[PDB]
């Protein structure tokens, strides 16, 4: 061995294991899915109740970067909200210098280069987080990007990060997100995260949803309570 | 900027780089010093002459001021930069407080320079020990020494270098009150002490006396030949 201690050494077949070891820390965080509808993006995070002592609304795995940009994370939570600070700080310098709201193809480009810069040196480690970015503009439509711990970003019509990643995006392509508005989506986001994580491994869990589009007038915010109670009314009909 | 902890603790509480440096002292040449009530006398042994070199460039007794002499052992490369930093400090004292430097003050400068240097980043400790000898104001002759860890420490008689345990065990059975009776009688203690060390039969010894008002005065190898005659002559008749 010895070829996998630093992030500055290639393997004798040419790959960095410190990045691949940090990717393995993502599959212990639970599940964060997000699909974009015809006219908006809907996030969704299923949230483990570790003990009864915590408070409903603690330690949110679903951030708010700019007025229109949203973030849902999966990984090591201290590194997640550290990336959420620089992305929130990067969007401020765009507006203060260029005058208008930052677009997503540039915003996910600036963050991913900051993530990539920690996979070159022995002095730092790679981040242990993967996350998603989604927004809506009236001149651009909806956008949905995703960033791995290596620093690779792409666009998606729907993606998933967590433990059961393939078991979640199996059912995403059963949907038809090209035509659905972001009202029927909210019932379908919650349904596909109910069929995952059987009650053997986890006792109880918590739904946490997010929501952006022109129905939210471009601003990013959480769903109201009554709409996600309809999705939890749409919970126990997957047993047929 | 080389930032690395050189001196670290051991799992039983020692500083290995400090006590490795104390063995570099333990194979430098022997330096002996006693003090009389009016004239101090210190003198190195093991000059180890090769009769083709300049005799003044090899000296190990130097002066920091008019009143303060200094001898050392260990490796000579680190020695003469501690001296040159001590000459600056004892000179800048005169720009401050007007009296000349007391002999106790300059050892606290050397020992505190030597300690914090076993504390910094990327610096091996010094590998020298010293003997600082001076007769201060109000004519009080006294001496000190400096461990490489930086513990200044006064004495009545001392000896460092290669073969220092045997000489110190020799002085405790030999340092009486009447051994410092006369000025020429205290010198007969030192020449008897260094002869009880690595051989130095009048050809490898270099004493240097100071009579509390002069500077240092190296006697040439004629009185040392005169003193080693009478030091053996008293031993010739008693036994």
């Amino acid at each position: 061995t010895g070829y996998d201690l630093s992030a500055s050494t290639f393997s004798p077949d040419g790959r960095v294991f410190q990045v691949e070891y940090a990717m393995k820390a993502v599959e212990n965080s639970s599940t964060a899915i997000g699909i974009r509808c015809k006219d908006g993006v809907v996030f969704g995070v299923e949230k483990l109740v570790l003990s009864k002592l915590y408070e409903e609304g603690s330690n949110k795995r679903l951030f708010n970067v700019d007025r229109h940009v949203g973030m849902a994370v999966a990984g090591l939570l201290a590194d997640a909200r550290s990336l959420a600070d620089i992305a929130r700080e990067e969007a401020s310098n765009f507006r203060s210098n260029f005058g208008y709201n930052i677009p997503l193809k540039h915003l996910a480009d600036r963050v991913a280069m900051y993530v990539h810069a920690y996979t070159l040196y022995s002095a730092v480690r790679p981040f242990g987080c993967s996350f998603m970015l989604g927004s809506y503009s009236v001149n651009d439509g909806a956008q949905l990007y995703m960033i791995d711990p290596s620093g690779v970003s792409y666009g998606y019509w729907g993606c998933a990060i967590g433990k059961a990643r393939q078991a979640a995006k199996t059912e995403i392509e059963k949907l038809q997100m090209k035509e659905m508005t972001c009202r029927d989506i909210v019932k379908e986001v919650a349904k596909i995260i109910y069929i995952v994580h059987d009650e053997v491994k986890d006792k109880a869990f918590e739904l946490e949803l997010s929501w952006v589009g022109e129905l939210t007038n471009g601003r990013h915010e959480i769903v109201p309570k009554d709409i996600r109670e309809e999705a939890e009314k749409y919970a126990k009909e997957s047993l047929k | 900027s080389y930032d690395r902890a050189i001196t670290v603790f051991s799992p039983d509480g020692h500083l290995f780089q400090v006590e490795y440096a104390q063995e570099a002292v333990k194979k430098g040449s022997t330096a002996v010093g006693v003090r009389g009530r009016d004239i101090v006398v210190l003198g190195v042994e093991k000059k180890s002459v090769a009769k083709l070199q300049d005799e003044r460039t090899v000296r190990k007794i130097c002066a920091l001021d008019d009143n303060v002499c200094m001898a050392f052992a260990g490796l000579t490369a680190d020695a003469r930069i501690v001296i040159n930093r001590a000459r600056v400090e004892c000179q800048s004292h005169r720009l401050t407080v007007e009296d000349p430097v007391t002999v106790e003050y300059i050892t606290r400068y050397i020992a505190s320079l030597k300690q914090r240097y076993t504390q910094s980043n990327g610096r091996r400790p010094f590998g020298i020990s010293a003997l600082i000898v001076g007769f201060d104001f109000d004519g009080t002759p006294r001496l000190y020494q400096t461990d490489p860890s930086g513990t200044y420490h006064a004495w009545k008689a001392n000896a460092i270098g290669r073969g220092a345990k045997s000489v110190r065990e020799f002085l405790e059975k030999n340092y009486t009150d009447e051994a410092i009776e006369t000025d020429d009688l205290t010198i007969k203690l030192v020449i008897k002490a260094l002869l009880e060390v690595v051989q130095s039969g009048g050809k490898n010894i270099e004493l240097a006396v100071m009579r509390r008002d002069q500077s240092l005065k190296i006697l040439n190898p004629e009185e040392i030949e005169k003193y080693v005659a009478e030091i053996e002559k008293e031993k010739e008749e008693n036994e």
Partner: protein, 228 residues
């Protein structure tokens, strides 16, 4: 093979902070006792050679007129912490025109005690006792290489620490007097040291509410020895 200087144990403590706790078991023993009449505070010298001058070494040194100290473990790096404590009491006098209390001296040193690293290099291998009389009466504190300080009533620090701490819990009570607390400590030092006790192996220093920091010398000290 080589860790850093900044590495946790699998048991969780550290390595070189715990190693420095081992280093203060090699120093000379020291005893301080807090009494409502005042703080007495003693040490041995551990004289090595007959040719050595005895008064050149010291363990008791003063910080201010009303605060004394006592050191153990290594000595050469104790002189750094003493000098930081002296400057700290003068900056407090300069700006506030009063005397810094005994507790707030100690945390000013204890914040310095754990600051090694690889920026801006090892912990300090000393252990200190702080005797003083502030406005809350006489006080006695004890810091650590780890930077932990706590008020004690009768603390024994050195190579003979746990042997003295057992014999010190049986003689102390809350209503001592200073004349007998001095006599009680020299009985403990007489048991634990190597050589016989005289007026040169040890030294004492007391601080009272009335007078300032006073250190005994070789004339008023041996009356307690002959009347032990």
């Amino acid at each position: 093979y080589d860790r850093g200087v900044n590495t946790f144990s699998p048991e969780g403590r550290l390595f070189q902070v715990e190693y420095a706790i081992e280093a203060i078991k090699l120093g000379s023993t020291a005893i301080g006792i807090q009494t409502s009449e005042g703080v007495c505070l003693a040490v041995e010298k551990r004289i090595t050679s007959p040719l050595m001058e005895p008064s050149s070494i010291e363990k008791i040194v003063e910080i201010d007129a009303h605060i004394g100290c006592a050191m153990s473990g290594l000595i050469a790096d104790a002189k750094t912490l003493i000098d930081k404590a002296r400057v700290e009491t003068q900056n407090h006098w300069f700006t506030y025109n009063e005397t810094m209390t005994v507790e707030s001296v100690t945390q000013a040193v204890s914040n310095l005690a754990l600051q090694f690293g690889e920026e801006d290099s090892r912990p300090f291998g000393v252990a200190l006792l702080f005797g003083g009389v502030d406005e809350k009466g006489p006080q006695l504190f004890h810091m650590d290489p780890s930077g932990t300080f706590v008020q004690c009533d009768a603390r024994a620090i050195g190579s003979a620490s746990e042997g003295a701490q057992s014999s010190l819990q049986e003689v102390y009570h809350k209503s001592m007097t200073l004349k007998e607390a001095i006599k009680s400590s020299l009985i403990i030092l007489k048991q634990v040291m190597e050589e016989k006790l005289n007026a040169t192996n040890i030294e004492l220093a007391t601080v009272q509410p009335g007078q300032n920091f006073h250190m005994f010398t070789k004339e008023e000290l041996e009356e307690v020895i002959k009347d032990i």
